[PDB]
Design a protein around this nucleic acid. Structure first.
Ligand SMILES: [Mg+2]
Ligand SMILES: [Mg+2]
Ligand SMILES: [Zn+2]
Ligand SMILES: [Zn+2]
Lengths: 69, 203, 177, 30, 129, 37, 156, 57
RNA sequence: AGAGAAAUAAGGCCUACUUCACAAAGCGCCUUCUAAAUGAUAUCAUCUCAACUUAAUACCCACACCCACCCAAGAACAGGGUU
RNA sequence: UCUAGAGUCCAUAUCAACAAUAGGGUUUACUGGAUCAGGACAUCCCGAUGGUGCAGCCGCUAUUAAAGGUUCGUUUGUUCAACG
């Protein structure tokens, strides 16, 4: 229940640099790991929608916090 | 209601009280037996069907399956079997015979048969093409088709009229009236001409 | 999952029969879903040369609904090959003539234009009305959701949801309504 | 009324006048 | 019956605005439409229902498109499923010549009087297929 | 019906109408000036 | 404000409101502890990791082979450790870096089993009518890394 | 899936007092049951596909 | 709304005439299937890009042979008959 | 397309002047016929309808219609034209 724009455009917003070869391999050969990744993507998508819906800079989402180098 | 499988004998005239002439064709009903029945939804919706056979034939010159069919049916093999589309209430048990009296004069009747085979024919004997004139120099073109197709299209359309085999295909004449019936020899006297040659089975 | 070799291979590439209703659904949306499923583009294990296509069973194909005036405008065209045999027939006419053909032509258009197309179309089963053969009912697995939500008319609004909605305006009383 | 080079077309499209939305719709308020 | 006693913003000339709807209702919103029409499918006069011109006409086209999809069965004057039909079904000529790509003739869908409903997808919704 | 590109009524008992998807100008008395778009 | 129910007042998606972070942090800590106690007791089987290497992301597991198209200046059979693990997973749990996992949490070992030169590849350019035809043969070198162990430690 | 066709898929799952202990694929139900037995045997004997790989170090 | 008669086109036949003569033919014969009613937007009215109601069958159709002879079937191969 | 000019009264029953908006060419000076024809409709006939100043068949214009048909001759050959 999650399109492809969402998955990639919101895994990177969680700072996971998994590429597409390994994403396909996970989808075929490790279904539950891919299930988790899809859950993570949907979580981040919801966090983004909730944040943008709000007024101002209310505390960021629990997964939307960037980690700096 | 079911129809007959007759054999075309020949032709004769026959006049009328109003003073005109009317050629007719003689159709002899030979051994016409209803051979098979197929149910309304056995044909999947169209109608009920009867299989009628005609013109008893030898039994040493048929395939094993046809001999088995006729043996279980208790008849000697026919030559042509034809399928008539009838309503349910017109059913007739297989094994019953049909007789020229099946028809009566005063009605009209349709006849279908295999036309006479002219063989391979050129275009004017086959489609009535005005061939090219004679002398005045028309060398090596007298009975030839002209231009088969136009020039911009680089093909000849399907369904273009061209040399090839003629006749020997089934065809139907409609509206033929029945004047006389000979119930002792089983002849039907159908108006006009009927396709086929003599001694060939018509439906 | 510790399946032996051959059973695993059979489990992964097996074919699945998907029902898909069509009542008041547009031909194009059913066509999109059917195209995806027939091609195999819903399997993470997809490939063009692996023949992963599945089966689709669209019923109530007689009851589809075309957006707009398409019934009177969408013209399907065919040509026998013989001169003068160019026939153009509207959607209403071709629907009466063959109640399955509109959806079949939609799915035929969307599918890819290669040799495999016919094979995929041998796995599309279209039945005009609710009736489906037993040998096909006993094969279905899932039931894909309809892509258009059938809007519901006043005949099936209960008084609860009718009086819940406000009364947006006031009539005069002298008026005869 | 000749055709324009494509880039001139894009320039004409991007620079097209956009009017200021009225604060309220006149129909439902003076 | 009269106005429900809870108007979201009183002091409004168009009853389509008194409840904050002006760009917010579609054809299938049968509940909203089924109180602007007579018991025989026809629209009430504007001078009574009180809508503005730009909302009266939108309701008119919405009720037409509602009838043509069979969403008001009990409002008659006593084979083919369609929705979002702008033209009356019996006054449209077939598209025998759908021109080339750059002069295509495309089939109208929906009405353009609802051009300004609240969109919810990035690609704006097409009025012509 | 006289085909015209702009439908102008002539007397006071004719009426514009939309029929079959086109604009006509019918008249009961003096039917001499029907029109079609 | 209030607007009577219609087909467009609300959008066609559900109002998904996220759990209050105060309780969510406790829940996350609880599940993290559960996974940790799975790791400590050996409650896992074979493991797989998404290792980043020469430039590629290989999905690997114990005893498998990998072929890198670049020589790695290592003698034949010299064990090495592959840093840059992006994701390591077992049957019931899997750990995702942001974007890498710490040096302590995951340890991936590999060995160099073969160094060779790939099969000859052709590079031919041709242009019509200009007498432009040239042919080159290239053999890029490569090396085969066996992966010997993916071990994990209970540092969460 | 595909009960009547020539390419069926039956997933047969053994149970032990309302609790699953295996699940097998096949084309016939007999073969699916046999494979369910094989997977259950593997799970009980600790020889699954995803067992702790032998430790060579 | 019917009834006769002719031609042409397609399809077919050889009882008579005709060219001819175990037959093929035509000059001969036969068959051919935008005006209303109710009515709203605009309460009268209004035919309605308003809802709503009115103005082709036929033909083919037998899983399993083929040496020989005959044939109205045929270029060869096929097809019909050999009781 | 403006009717503006006419038409025994009156623009719309007809021409409808200029212009405007449309689709289409203009090369000389200082390629038919037979044979078979495929196609469009901007329709000659047949078919359906409106108005008429046809009070009526036919006429006139206008809409619709391309399933079917669209002759034989004398003189002559930039290929037409005339004539029965
Ligand atoms: Mg000669
Ligand atoms: Mg002769
Ligand atoms: Zn308003
Ligand atoms: Zn008038």
């Amino acid at each position: 229940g999650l399109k492809y724009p969402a998955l990639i455009g919101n895994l990177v917003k969680c700072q996971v640099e998994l590429n597409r070869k390994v994403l396909a391999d996970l989808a075929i050969y490790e279904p539950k790991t891919f299930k988790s990744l899809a859950a993570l993507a949907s979580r981040r998508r919801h966090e983004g929608f909730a944040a943008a819906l709000g007024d101002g800079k209310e505390p960021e989402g629990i997964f939307s916090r960037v980690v700096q180098y | 209601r079911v129809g007959l499988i007759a054999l075309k004998l020949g032709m004769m005239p026959l006049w009328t009280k109003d003073g005109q002439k009317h050629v007719v064709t003689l159709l002899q009903v030979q051994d016409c037996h209803v051979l098979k029945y197929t149910s309304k939804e056995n044909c999947n919706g169209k109608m009920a069907t009867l299989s009628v056979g005609g013109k008893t034939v030898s039994r040493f010159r048929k395939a094993t399956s046809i001999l088995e069919f006729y043996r279980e049916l208790g008849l000697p093999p026919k030559q042509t079997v034809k399928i008539f589309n009838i309503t349910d209430n017109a059913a007739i048990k297989p094994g019953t015979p049909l007789y020229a009296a099946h028809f009566r004069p005063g009605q009209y009747v349709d006849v279908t048969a295999k036309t006479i085979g002219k063989g391979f024919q050129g275009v004017m004997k086959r489609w009535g093409f005005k061939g090219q004139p004679a002398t005045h120099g028309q060398t090596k073109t007298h009975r030839r088709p002209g231009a088969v197709a136009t020039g911009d299209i680089g093909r000849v359309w399907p369904g273009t009229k061209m040399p090839g085999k003629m006749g020997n295909i089934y065809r139907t004449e409609y509206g033929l009236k029945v004047w006389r019936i000979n119930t002792k020899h089983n002849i039907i006297y159908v108006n006009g001409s009927v396709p086929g040659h003599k001694n060939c089975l018509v439906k | 999952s510790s399946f032996s070799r051959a059973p695993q291979q059979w489990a992964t590439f097996a074919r699945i029969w998907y029902l898909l209703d069509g009542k008041m659904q547009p031909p194009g949306k059913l066509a999109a879903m059917a195209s995806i499923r027939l091609q195999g583009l819903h399997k993470p294990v997809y490939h063009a040369l692996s023949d992963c296509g599945d089966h689709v069973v669209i019923m109530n194909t007689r009851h589809i609904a075309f957006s707009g005036n398409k019934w009177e405008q969408k013209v399907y065209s065919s040509h026998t090959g013989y001169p003068g045999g160019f026939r153009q027939v509207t959607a209403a006419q071709l629907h009466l003539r063959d109640p399955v053909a509109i959806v079949k032509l939609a799915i035929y258009g969307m599918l890819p234009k290669n040799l495999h197309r016919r094979t995929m179309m041998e796995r599309l089963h279209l039945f005009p009305d609710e009736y489906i053969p037993e040998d096909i009912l006993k094969n279905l697995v899932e039931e894909l959701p309809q892509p258009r939500k059938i809007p519901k008319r006043l005949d099936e609004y209960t008084q609860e949801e009718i009086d819940a909605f406000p009364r947006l305006w006031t009539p005069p009383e002298d008026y005869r309504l | 009324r000749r055709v324009m080079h494509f880039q001139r077309q894009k320039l004409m499209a991007v620079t097209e006048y956009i009017p200021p939305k009225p604060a309220i719709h006149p129909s439902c308020l003076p | 019956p009269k106005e429900s006693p809870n108007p979201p913003n009183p002091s409004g000339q168009c009853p389509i605005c008194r409840w904050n709807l002006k760009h917010k209702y579609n054809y299938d919103d049968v509940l909203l439409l089924s109180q602007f029409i007579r018991p025989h499918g026809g629209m009430l006069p504007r001078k009574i229902t009180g809508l503005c011109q730009e909302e009266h006409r939108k309701i008119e086209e919405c009720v037409k498109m509602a009838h043509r999809a069979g969403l008001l069965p009990n409002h008659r004057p006593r084979q083919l499923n369609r929705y979002l039909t702008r033209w009356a079904p019996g006054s449209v000529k077939p598209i025998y010549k759908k021109g080339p790509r750059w002069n295509r003739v495309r089939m109208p869908v929906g009405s353009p009087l609802l051009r300004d409903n609240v969109c919810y997808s990035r690609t704006p919704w097409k009025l012509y297929h | 019906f006289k085909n015209k590109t702009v439908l102008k009524k002539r007397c006071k008992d004719c009426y514009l109408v939309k029929r079959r998807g086109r604009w006509y100008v019918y008249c009961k008395t003096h039917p001499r000036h029907k029109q079609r778009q | 404000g209030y607007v009577p129910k219609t087909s467009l007042s609300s959008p066609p998606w559900p109002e998904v409101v996220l759990p209050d972070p105060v309780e969510e942090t406790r829940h996350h800590a609880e599940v993290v502890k559960k996974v940790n106690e799975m790791i400590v007791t050996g409650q896992y089987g074979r493991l797989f990791a998404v290792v980043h290497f020469a430039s590629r992301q290989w999905k690997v597991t114990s005893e498998d082979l990998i072929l890198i198209g670049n020589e790695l200046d290592l003698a034949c059979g010299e064990r090495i450790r592959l840093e840059k693990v992006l994701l390591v997973g077992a049957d019931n749990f899997t750990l995702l870096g942001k974007p890498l996992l710490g040096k302590d949490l995951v340890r991936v070992e590999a060995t160099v089993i073969e160094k060779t030169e790939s099969w000859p590849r052709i590079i031919m350019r041709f242009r019509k009518r200009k007498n432009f035809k040239k042919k080159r043969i290239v053999t890029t070198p490569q090396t085969v890394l066996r992966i010997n162990s993916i071990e994990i430690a209970p540092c969460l | 899936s595909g009960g009547t066709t020539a390419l069926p898929l039956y997933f047969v799952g053994l149970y032990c007092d309302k609790k699953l202990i295996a699940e097998g694929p096949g084309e016939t139900v007999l073969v699916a049951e046999e494979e369910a037995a094989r997977v259950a045997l593997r799970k009980l004997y600790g020889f699954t596909e995803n067992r702790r790989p032998w430790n060579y170090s």
